[model samples]
Target: MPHAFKPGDLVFAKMKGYPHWPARIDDIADGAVKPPPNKYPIFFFGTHETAFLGPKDLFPYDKSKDKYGKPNKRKGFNEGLWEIQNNPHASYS
Candidate 1:
């Protein structure tokens, strides 16, 4: 499915801190058009590359997915008796 976003839409950048981490940047369309494919240009955001492709994964950090390109899953878990089990990577922590 295609999502209709406003050209002036304010999206958040990637989370700079956490287990997953992210490279985030706030971005918005420079035109009246939006993303999630196109209506006429048919290329969505072309040249400029605003167009949304097959999957949201291609939207980039600030564009979509995790809102900042971080893993969709939570980075860490609550510290409990099984706290270490919260995250496989954290077990090494």
Candidate 2:
């Protein structure tokens, strides 16, 4: 389903070969009219890159999922755990 997101909305973008990470919607292309899929240009925090991710690849930002280190010692677990558990190549990386 398509979501209605504003120009500055903070959301999670799940790109191929990457985990769902927080990104801020970029307002560079805030023109009144454009192609349907031309929406959602976002700026990634760590990478500092902006790109148009599809609606299916974007979801609401979950603050609880952003963490690193052991579960018992930390308040939350690592975000890469999902890929580590499912991807066969995760071990090689």
Candidate 3:
């Protein structure tokens, strides 16, 4: 299939093995042009288990601790927002 996406474009992709699950297009990987060293594009999606903190509800200041001594930061996809975690599958490019 032709590439139907670009940087920062909001799109959807069908989750493998779960056709009913819709995932947002977070990034893409061109294995031929910039393969191996570079990481593949990641797709994000909000599900009942992941709705607490998806991009749609994230705020910059939410990174701070709240008055109740609880962290304001949410979970799920937020774990990969500004950084890439260590993954043996992809080396730093």
Relative to the unseen true structure, what is the C-alpha lDDT of residue 89 in candidate 2, on a scale of 0 to 100?
A: 30
Per-residue lDDT tens digits for candidate 3, residues 1-93, read 534334333322223343222222233355533323323243443332211123332222222213112222434333333222223122224
Candidate 1 Cα outliers beyond 4 Å, as residue runs: 1-3, 13-93
lDDT of 1 by residue, 1-82 (tens): 5455433222321223523222211133377444344321112110111223222222332334343333334423222212
TM-score per candidate: 0.17, 0.53, 0.26
**Candidate 1 local distance difference test against the native:** 0.27
Provide the lowest-lDDT 10-residue window in model 3: 63-72
Each model's RMSD to truth, in Å? 14.9, 11.5, 12.5
Candidate 1: count the clashes. 3
Per-residue lDDT of candidate 2, residues 1-93 (tens digit)? 644876655566677766566555656535633434645676665455567776677665544245421232211123334332344132221
Better model by lDDT: candidate 1 vs candidate 3: 3
